[PDB]
From Swiss-Prot, chain B:
Active site: 41, 145
Effect of residue 142 to A: Does not affect ability to cleave and inactivate human TRMT1
Regulation of this protein's activity per its record: Inhibited by pyridone-containing alpha-ketoamides compounds 13a and 13b. In turn, alpha-ketoamide 13b (tert-butyl (1-((S)-1-(((S)-4-(benzylamino)-3,4-dioxo-1-((S)-2-oxopyrrolidin-3-yl)butan-2-yl)amino)-3-cyclopropyl-1-oxopropan-2-yl)-2-oxo-1,2-dihydropyridin-3-yl)carbamate) inhibits SARS-CoV-2 replication in human lung cells. Inhibited ex vivo by michael acceptor inhibitor N3. Inhibited ex vivo by compound 11a and 11b.
Lineage summary: Viruses, Riboviria, Orthornavirae, Pisuviricota, Pisoniviricetes
Organism superkingdom: Viruses
Coiled-coil features, chain-numbered ranges: none
Task performed by this protein: Cleaves the C-terminus of replicase polyprotein at 11 sites. Recognizes substrates containing the core sequence [ILMVF]-Q-|-[SGACN]. Cleaves and inactivates human TRMT1, preventing tRNA guanine(26)-dimethylation of tRNAs. May cleave human NLRP1 in lung epithelial cells, thereby activating the NLRP1 inflammasome pathway. May cleave human GSDMD, triggering alternative GSDME-mediated epithelial cell death upon activation of the NLRP1 inflammasome, which may enhance the release interleukins 1B, 6, 16 and 18. Also able to bind an ADP-ribose-1''-phosphate (ADRP).
Designated name of the protein: 3C-like proteinase nsp5
SUBUNIT field: 3CL-PRO exists as monomer and homodimer. Only the homodimer shows catalytic activity. Interacts with host FBXO22; this interaction promotes the proteasomal degradation of nsp5.
Segment of the intact protein contained: 3264 to 3563 of 7096
Catalytic activity: TSAVLQ-|-SGFRK-NH2 and SGVTFQ-|-GKFKK the two peptides corresponding to the two self-cleavage sites of the SARS 3C-like proteinase are the two most reactive peptide substrates. The enzyme exhibits a strong preference for substrates containing Gln at P1 position and Leu at P2 position
Species whose genome carries this gene: Severe acute respiratory syndrome coronavirus 2
Residues in cross-link Glycyl lysine isopeptide (Lys-Gly) (interchain with G-Cter in ubiquitin): 5, 90
Cell compartments where the protein resides: Host cytoplasm; Host Golgi apparatus; Host nucleus
Topological domains annotated Cytoplasmic: 1-300
Amino acid sequence: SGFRKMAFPSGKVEGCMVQVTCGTTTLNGLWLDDVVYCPRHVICYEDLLIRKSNHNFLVQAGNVQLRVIGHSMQNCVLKLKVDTANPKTPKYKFVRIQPGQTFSVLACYNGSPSGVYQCAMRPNFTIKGSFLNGSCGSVGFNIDYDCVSFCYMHHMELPTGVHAGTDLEGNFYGPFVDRQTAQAAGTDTTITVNVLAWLYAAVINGDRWFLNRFTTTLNDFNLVAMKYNYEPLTQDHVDILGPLSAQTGIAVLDMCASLKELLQNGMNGRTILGSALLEDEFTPFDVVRQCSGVTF
Amino acid sequence: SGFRKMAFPSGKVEGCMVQVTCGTTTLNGLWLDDVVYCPRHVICTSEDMLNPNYEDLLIRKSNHNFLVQAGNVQLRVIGHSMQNCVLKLKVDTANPKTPKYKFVRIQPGQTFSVLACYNGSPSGVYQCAMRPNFTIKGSFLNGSCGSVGFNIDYDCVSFCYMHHMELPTGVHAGTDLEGNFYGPFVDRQTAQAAGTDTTITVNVLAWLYAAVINGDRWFLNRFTTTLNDFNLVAMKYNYEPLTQDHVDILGPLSAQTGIAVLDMCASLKELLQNGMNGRTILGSALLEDEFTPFDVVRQC
Ligand SMILES: O=C1C[C@]2(CCOc3ccc(Cl)cc32)C(=O)N1c1cncc2ccccc12
Ligand SMILES: O=C1C[C@]2(CCOc3ccc(Cl)cc32)C(=O)N1c1cncc2ccccc12
């Protein structure tokens, strides 16, 4: 029993974290094989990069200084070629994720991991992380079997305290740019499929008070969802929730009528999994993984 | 900016997780140097659930009855001893991945990271607090016995918890790494119940300071209170008493924000009386008590 916000074990990623220093700027780099990936704002772009030499980049892996033998830029990420392949390079891939998908963040300062937490790509393409100055270059990842899928690299903080970054190919998530200028996160919405997955996790853990005898049409639920700033629920989402629906005996549209009552009436002093709000940072896959004990 | 429930990076602990098998029983072990630590109930059978005599069961065991697996490698057990509720299996190989470490017994209210494992393989990491009733509200399934709780402070891993069992309410009980249980629990299937739980007051106040540091001030008020008057109120909401030690511990956050501890205590009294009124504090509609004053300073 129990349901916690749970991150993937960070060991495979800790072995890849290095410190990158260029001029007065120090941030984190991801060392995979003979390449160090980090945000291109460390040079502070084609004109600034051409003026740099390999020795201007100081890369430190532990107390060992790596020697940079090449440098190139791919979108908003800088790739520093090094003389040594990282012996701790795990099996990995670079994946771009969609809003609603969750991942673990290994927060680092000066190439040293300090914390790990779980979070979700918000529908407005921001992440509600926890980062201070020096965290740039920290990475978001998932683990599939023995393979690390890198999905995020941290670049900046928006005026509202939320965070913006890119995939490992340097493409930003959302309408953001990597410069000090006026940029605002769009109005956020709740990840509906994740709330439903979390209501199934609550039922699996013995919490049933919110269940009702009612069901709804997908169209009628989507009208209610639009009204409460909830993301639309698609037939794909309904299909994805199928295994949890089969395990608990509560059909997806039946759980939707429970969600619809919760949105119109509230919790009435009650909690679900120790929370008084509807939690939306657990995907259907996260719920199945935690309620079945999948290992890495 | 931002405030999240944050665990320590688990790499140093992952390289210590092994699988320990005794007969039909399989759980997790912690391999540090040439010793594997694990819950002593790995030696129990179905008939020995209610009232096991561990000294008697252990004397009947030989080194080759313990199967220890680190990855696809089987380690050879060359000795075995019991310290309270933990079994210590001496092995013929020192773990090359042994970090700098120490064993610490923690107090209620203290937080730590849990590396949940099944069959010697880590599956997830999360942050926990030792409840005032000495239980933890973890996320554990069958096979999680031996999973450990730890903190990391500058390269050194302090091991503070080893998972042993789940109580009827879904909460969890375990020991320090010396095998001493936290709370009035025993490693037997006899009827056991967690005492009524209370809110960790000092942790809620630390979290209200984290909210002020992050820009939220709506819950603040012009009032202050006496320490005694706060305690008379707080205990009516099942909150732990706030001691002068707790007031002293909150001093640095009080200095950083300009809000005296007894002034923040008056904000807390008002939040208890009024509720949140549709508002949230650090994205939560409840008062969060699993962040210590030390965690708040570390993260902010
Ligand atoms: O370290 C940096 C560089 C900066 C600030 C300067 O202006 C720029 C311009 C471009 C870019 Cl890509 C990043 C930045 C930024 O947001 N951060 C941080 C990143 N995450 C959290 C933070 C919290 C507190 C202060 C800073 C933070
Ligand atoms: O694996 C075990 C052994 C057991 C089961 C029998 O009763 C006892 C009695 C004493 C001792 Cl020390 C251990 C146990 C136990 O609680 N667990 C669990 C431990 N954490 C979570 C769990 C979830 C679901 C089922 C079991 C769980």
